[PDB]
Design a protein around this ligand. Structure first.
Ligand SMILES: [Cl-]
Ligand SMILES: [Mg+2]
Ligand SMILES: [Mg+2]
Ligand code: NA
Ligand code: NA
Ligand code: NA
Length: 326
DNA sequence: CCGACAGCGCATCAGC
DNA sequence: GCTGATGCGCG
DNA sequence: GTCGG
């Protein structure tokens, strides 16, 4: 983190644009610049030096000059002092509360954690759970705990049907020493792009995980995506582990490689890669990579037998999960 | 300039 | 009930 | 806010 100060600033700007301005392209612009700068192997001495990097334009360069000179950014100083902006940014930290809901709550005079607690009747289900575990969802998960969680999920899945394959993705798969949550990619031979030969494939796994008290709450749930909450079991007399966010995604088995590429991320890496795919005349989602026709319409799914096959199509050297932390 | 900026599942709502 | 739009979340 | 054409 040679350039921690700068990337924090950019990230704070990004958050402002997303949460308050609701300007998503500005948000993405700031995130891209923060990311490109975070991997720059030199301590930055000037905006000019920074502007050499792709994603860092004139406006960001001037901000980096201001920051380097004074150690702060007036624009942010002001944003921090504004009550409405500060309140909105805060409320968006609750899972289920976005920019729109946040601004709406602020209108109604609901602007603090205390306000939320006393107005639970004004929250949808997801938001109520996000509030319930607000503190816990702030905490990172040590890889040691991720490992225990992996064992539980894989073993419980095995118990439901030995043919399931559960893979832990996200930052965990990228080798990080701590994770924001647990991402599980699930497959079963009875669910392919060709046919769904069994219903409740995701339900049964979710049910089994609730049975053993691993999954504690549900934010949302469909036939292919579960989003919820889980918790490690603690021993006699031990303080409980924090509750943790868990996402489970059921992907057609013959589409595993596109799925694991997606679920491994990072999010910025995915955006970069998919953007590059477009430039190369392909479109990539978690299911397939397809050529773009002359009209700009997706063609038929190209054959894929590894993650590297995807990189090959778009003429990128293969990058291991651990090098996709952008 | 000015168009493009990745892609998609689930929840909730409006309108029919 | 459905469809489509929008909010929010995931990487 | 940044970039490519
Ligand atoms: Cl924007
Ligand atoms: Mg994750
Ligand atoms: Mg994340
Ligand atoms: Na640049
Ligand atoms: Na939120
Ligand atoms: Na996740």
């Amino acid at each position: 983190t040679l350039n921690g100060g700068i990337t924090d600033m950019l990230t704070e700007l990004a958050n402002f644009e997303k949460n308050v301005s609701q300007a998503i392209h500005k948000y993405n612009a700031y995130r891209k610049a923060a990311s490109v700068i975070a991997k720059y192997p030199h301590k930055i001495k000037s905006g000019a030096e920074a502007k050499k990097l792709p994603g860092v334009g004139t406006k960001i360069a001037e901000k980096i000059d201001e920051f380097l000179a004074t150690g702060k950014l007036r624009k942010l100083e002001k944003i921090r002092q504004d009550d409405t902006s500060s309140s909105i940014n805060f409320l968006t930290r609750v899972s289920g509360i976005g920019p729109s809901a946040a601004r709406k709550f602020v209108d109604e005079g609901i602007k603090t954690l205390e306000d939320l607690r006393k107005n639970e009747d004004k929250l949808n289900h997801h938001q109520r759970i996000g509030l319930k575990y607000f503190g816990d969802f702030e905490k990172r998960i040590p890889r040691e705990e991720m490992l225990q969680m992996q064992d539980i999920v894989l073993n419980e899945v095995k118990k439901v049907d030995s043919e399931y394959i559960a893979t832990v993705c996200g930052s965990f798969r990228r080798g990080a020493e701590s994770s924001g949550d647990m991402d599980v990619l699930l497959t079963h031979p009875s669910f392919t792009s060709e046919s769904t030969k069994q219903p409740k494939l995701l339900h049964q796994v979710v049910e089994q995980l609730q049975k053993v008290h691993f999954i504690t709450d549900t934010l949302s749930k469909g036939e292919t995506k579960f989003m919820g909450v889980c918790q490690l079991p603690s021993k006699n007399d031990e303080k409980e582990y924090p509750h943790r966010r868990i996402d489970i995604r059921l992907i057609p088995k013959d589409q595993y490689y596109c799925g694991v590429l997606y679920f491994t991320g990072s999010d910025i890496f995915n955006k970069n890669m998919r953007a590059h795919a477009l430039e190369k005349g392909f479109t990539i989602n978690e299911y397939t990579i397809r050529p773009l026709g002359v009209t700009g319409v997706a063609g038929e799914p190209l054959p894929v037998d590894s993650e590297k096959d995807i990189f090959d199509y778009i003429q990128w050297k293969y990058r291991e999960p651990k090098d996709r932390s952008e």
